[PDB]
């Protein structure tokens with residue numbers, strides 16, 4: 001029983017909250033690894049709720065800090081031939097996409113590789129090539145972007161098909177924890193200099209999905225997968241194989257219709273309560289990610305939260321959800 | 332007085348259409364200012380419908396060609412201190428947004444100033460500074476982005492309000508075919524190096540509008556306005572004060588609920604048939620743009636069309652609509 005890693009990241013105030021002089025109800029203490037939320041009362045007398053997690057990232061945490069602390073170790077595990085999954089979980093508006101993908105610094109200040117606002121996906125793709133540049137491990141990188149909306153499956157990277165084209169899912173006869181998704185494009189990323197244009201094609205498909213499907217960016221779940229096939233050659237000419245897969249999952253907004261979100265919650269509850277039956281098959285998302293929930297994949301959850309008093313109830317909901325998830329045991 | 336000038340722009344075939352060896356049902360003859368549509372069957376015998384416009388631009392037409400032939404003369408009129416409007420009209424998918432805004436060339440190949448895929452808005456803003464930072468002109472540039480969705484008004488540039496906040500409109504007691512939009516932000520663009528980040532904020536707010544409102548990019552109407560206040564002192568020391576405004580309007584898609592689109596059509600019909608009553612007040616769009624529709628503003632329409640046989644009926648509908656509009660007299 002190796003526990004799932006669960007971390008918390010609080011977003012900073014936006015311009016509007018700044019000009020309204022907003023006070024944070026969230027204090028994160030990184031060294032105590034604690035998040036403390038003011039739940040009522042006043043200045044000189046108050047109620048709070050405090051939570052301990054594996055790591056906590058306050059409103060001022062930069063993208064590089066998150067990448068170095070959480071992702072760098074996981075990418076090392078992937079390169080060793082393990083499968084790893086990182087979920088982002090929290091209410092719409094708290095920074096799941098910011099964390100997982102990032103944004104461009106304004107006014108074309110930086111190239112993509114150096115942009116301090118880059119998130120997990122671009123940083124990860126850049127660093128694989130760097131880590132494996134001349135260590136004797138030959139490798140290939142392939143990426144896919146499978147998304148779930150109203151329990152239908154979409155491919156956000158395939159250049160032939162329109163986004164509206166549903167994919168079909170089947171059990172894998174060879175892997176009984178596994179599925180096969182008919183139609184899903186795997187794009188080979190040949191070098192660092194192919195990364196950005198591949199991601200641009202996905203961003204373009206994201207805009208069309210939003211035009212076509214109501215609140216697509218909030219209600220959809222996205223699974224960005226990167227698979228690294230590796231071959232080492234020993235001094236005696238024998239070849240050594242490993243395959244590492246990283247799933248980077250940007251969940252639908254948690255705020256309180258979404259069968260996959262509901263089933264994820266039920267799967268987590270089943271696993272933490274150690275009920276024998278765990279309802280993976282009750283949604284697409286949980287069938288796809290079966291191995292990341294009490295399976296042989298190394299899993300982390302980045303729980304995203306708001307500093308704003310406006311968001312107190314959903315913030316507490318997120319923390320309680322993430323804090324319960326700590327008790328999931330993966331092998 | 333000045334009839335509205337109407338130009339046609341046919342988009343080129345895309346990747347998929349080229350893959351499927353599509354043959355164009357449109358032939359554009361710019362010297363003759365004509366577009367010819369194959370309306371029945373064959374490439375060896377065929378019925379055709381033809382239309383003559385103020386200008387016609389075929390599939391080969393690039394953004395720079397549109398800029399030099401259409402935008403330059405209009406911007407020169409704006410800089411002389413006059414008001415001008417350019418509408419884009421046509422079915423979703425035919426290049427309204429491409430024409431008015433443009434896109435980025437992939438893989439960070441260009442800066443925004445030099446990107447060949449830049450449309451009217453960025454080219455205009457760049458050129459205002461280029462032209463006037465030259466001569467003996469003291470000038471200020473303000474922009475606003477007012478958008479209409481389901482007869483509600485949104486400000487898509489305001490960096491410190493969320494898009495969801497609707498604006499109110501009222502008649503302007505001083506200006507007769509004029510309105511006041513309470514809360515609409517005019518952003519000062521101090522120099523060329525402030526242009527892109529202002530547009531990026533708009534891009535960002537566009538994304539949130541699409542999440543919040545169904546089919547936003549297709550059903551919304553957007554009015555991007557640029558106002559230039561100029562104090563020109565001539566070589567001879569004379570000081571001329573002028574005010575120029577340019578409205579760049581990206582209309583909701585015309586394809587077969589949208590009160591402003593319906594009212595625009597009915598307004599054009601009344602103007603062409605010279606019905607004494609012209610129904611401006613029946614929608615927000617036509618009240619906001621009343622001076623551009625049989626008023627004192629110099630107005631042009633760019634009708635966008637498809638070369639694909641799939642789109643024949645909508646293409647014909649667009650051409651007929653646009654061709655009617657030629658008869659509208661402005662002052």
Ligand SMILES: Nc1ncnc2c1ncn2[C@@H]1O[C@H](COP(=O)(O)OP(=O)(O)O)[C@@H](O)[C@H]1O
Pocket residue numbers: 010011012059061090091092093094095096097098099103304
């Ligand atoms: N760590 C952060 N630093 C700066 N801005 C952030 C951060 N996290 C989120 N944001 C901002 O908050 C808003 C919501 O972030 P987003 O990634 O869209 O949230 P979600 O995907 O959870 O809805 C965006 O405007 C984004 O720029």
Ligand SMILES: Nc1ncnc2c1ncn2[C@@H]1O[C@H](COP(=O)(O)OP(=O)(O)O)[C@@H](O)[C@H]1O
Pocket residue numbers: 341342343392421422423424425426427428429430434635
């Ligand atoms: N003149 C053009 N040249 C190249 N591509 C174009 C042109 N016009 C439209 N397109 C392409 O067609 C698709 C739809 O264009 P878009 O601007 O979104 O149309 P609309 O705004 O009318 O829906 C886009 O992929 C765009 O790049």
Ligand SMILES: CCN(CC)C(=O)c1c(NC(=O)c2cccs2)sc2c1CCCC2
Pocket residue numbers: 100101102103104105112113115117118119121122145199200202203206224
């Ligand atoms: C900023 C526009 N971009 C970034 C290309 C994105 O859309 C994007 C990503 N962003 C990035 O790659 C970066 C942001 C800042 C520097 S790189 S990751 C990703 C997308 C869209 C779909 C696939 C996952």
Ligand SMILES: CCN(CC)C(=O)c1c(NC(=O)c2cccs2)sc2c1CCCC2
Pocket residue numbers: 431432433434435436442443444446448449450452453476527530531533534537555
């Ligand atoms: C490419 C992302 N961008 C371009 C910033 C756009 O959104 C954009 C425009 N595009 C541009 O400014 C360019 C395209 C290519 C070179 S510059 S004009 C405009 C927008 C969004 C809202 C206001 C009107």
Ligand SMILES: [Mg+2]
Pocket residue numbers: 096097098217218
């Ligand atoms: Mg998001």
Ligand SMILES: [Mg+2]
Pocket residue numbers: 427428429548549
């Ligand atoms: Mg458009």
